[model samples]
Target: ATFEIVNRCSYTVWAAASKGDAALDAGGRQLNSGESWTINVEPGTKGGKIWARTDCYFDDSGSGICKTGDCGGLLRCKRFGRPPTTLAEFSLNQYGKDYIDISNIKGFNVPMDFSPTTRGCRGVRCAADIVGQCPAKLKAPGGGCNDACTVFQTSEYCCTTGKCGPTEYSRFFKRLCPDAFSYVLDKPTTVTCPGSSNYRVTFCPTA
Candidate 1:
């Protein structure tokens, strides 16, 4: 499956993707407004995740920082990014199907839309400006609203034990992004697509 990343926002954003170091063009990318980068994923790619980093200032050597969705301070991420970020998760050609979603359970820093370019799958997205509506307690130090797990850190919020459920904090995010995984137990956000299609991830889709 091929992934086309589009930067529709006003400022530049660096893109990152990871698949357990299995290797593809899984590097950090600098995308300017209205620009895009395409990465092709081989069949059977598993545990694939993609995200965008905003407000970044990096040296020529690719060392420095990003305001949101940074991955270990490196352009090519070797690990997961620090939340609050909008995420696109995928598992291609897994058991004869494709699993995909725009997840906010880690919190949201940007608006995003995930959709298949062809006809066989349902599209899912979270296009709300979560950062603007972030509650004070759930706000990240840099910016953006944090997921309850990061802010409250309680078993109920984290869903680490017992029955997983949503809190008022989760509800706030849910109100804006009904299709996303707003909390830990938010179920079945994964939309299934045929293994032969391409997908698009749009940042600040409506901005």
Candidate 2:
């Protein structure tokens, strides 16, 4: 399967993808507005995640920091980046199908649309103004928004004991982006498609 990562934001963004122990697109690369990068997924790859990091500065050796979604301050991420990032996750050939979803459980940094390019499967998007609408206590240092668990760290929001329910914070996210995973243990929003389907993950998507 192929994954096309597009940047439609007004500012620059660095795209990163992690699949198992390998990083796609050389860990990450700069993508100006309207630019795009495509990644061909290795067969049997599972639990891959794609995301965008904003306001990043990397040196000659790709050593720098991103205001959000910074992955150990490295341009090439060997693991998932820091939170306050929008995520596009997928698993290929999972039980004869592909599973895909957009998740905001980590919080929201940029608007995103995760969609299948070939199959008639439904696409999911989270283009809401989450950053601007984030609760005061859940705001991040940068333009990104933080999740309640990241902010409070209490069992109520973190579900540490596995008995927590939705709070006002999670409801705010769910109200804006129903297609995304608002909080941990929230209802499943994942979609399944044919294993042959390619996907497009767009930042700041319009439609």
Candidate 3:
């Protein structure tokens, strides 16, 4: 029930991991270049997710907001991160297995990858620089890529009104990160790994 968060970006990245509504672990802290942080998750943990926040500024009392992936302006996130943020989600020990995946359904802020430290797990990665080439309509002004739903908010793009499917916009992200969830109702994006497996998350994964 342990996860390693690695920072490979030249700039600093503030890693955030939520342990349900109970509290936050490593929610607000600077992971400098080449540095890594390890978090221990308790048994029966549910609705767990990990993400990175960029361009964040905080005051001495730790009150601030992030340009991307801000969590209610709190250093310790009691909830999930906002959209336009890459996400790593997991539900451990569900149906005798662990469900894990990298999701772009919200969009992309940084390149990331997931690999189990041990075997018996199928690793999935989304190590593409989608922001640099983000579409004009789906681009965030501060930085990062925005999902079609966030940009258009239509049934075709948001996948609402029983019209859930991919558009040219979703295809753009799917093409770059085939293994990651590209949009709402995106299929074949999750991997079932053995429970209690030690996993590693790397930001700016080149390979």
Candidate 4:
């Protein structure tokens, strides 16, 4: 089976396959409204899960477009794998107080937007507890392991890295934001005001 993804989160998405890393030079992919794509999966895809990670971008020096730079932030498991696994829905109070859904993908085709009140539901909260402070590091979760954290650039992110593509920047933020939702995404906090991308923020056993 294959799946198509939509950018439902406030930011765009940054994604990669487990088999590939090292920046494939693959042009950036977008999940803008009404946008969709498909991927062929082995039976293994049915069990593991599907995820649309995210990252943000700034002025396109080469051209005005989303680049897979290494500075933007990211979203994790932003989408409940297409179908056969309903989106992990969230429960809220009449007043809109939100809570987490610590369940696994037991239902397929059910998405978070199923509620009549809200179009969709935000996934499990990503907890901020970087492995190291200042040099924080986001650890993979234990349970649903979708929890993730991203950092916003409070100031100029010098191109010290020499790699400033969107893909590169997204990975940078993952290491920067120690706390989940610690800062506003979509718009870069810096002069760049770059938009964020979607990725998974899996659930740590503690969450």
In terms of TM-score, the best-performing candidate is 2
- Single out the weakest 10-residue window by summed lDDT for candidate 4: 189-198
lDDT of each: 0.84, 0.89, 0.84, 0.27
Clashing pairs in 2: none
Error of 1 at 78 (Å): 1.8
- Candidate with the larger TM-score of 2 and 4: 2
> Please, what are the lDDT tens digits per residue for candidate 4 over residues 1-207?
222334444444443222122111222344543444443333212112333332334353422212222222222222223211223222223133333232211211111221122324333332233322222222222111221222232232222344333333334334443222221232222111011212232222132
Provide the TM-score for each candidate, comma-separated. Answer: 0.94, 0.95, 0.94, 0.26
Task: Tell me which residue pairs clash in candidate 1.
Answer: none
Give lDDT for model 3: 0.84
All candidates in order of TM-score, best leading: 2, 1, 3, 4
Instruction: Tell me the TM-score of model 3.
Output: 0.94
Candidate 1 vs candidate 4: which has greater TM-score? 1
Task: Evaluate candidate 4 by giving its C-alpha RMSD to the native, one decimal.
Answer: 17.4
Clashes of each: 0, 0, 0, 50
TM-score of 1: 0.94
Ranking by lDDT: 2, 3, 1, 4
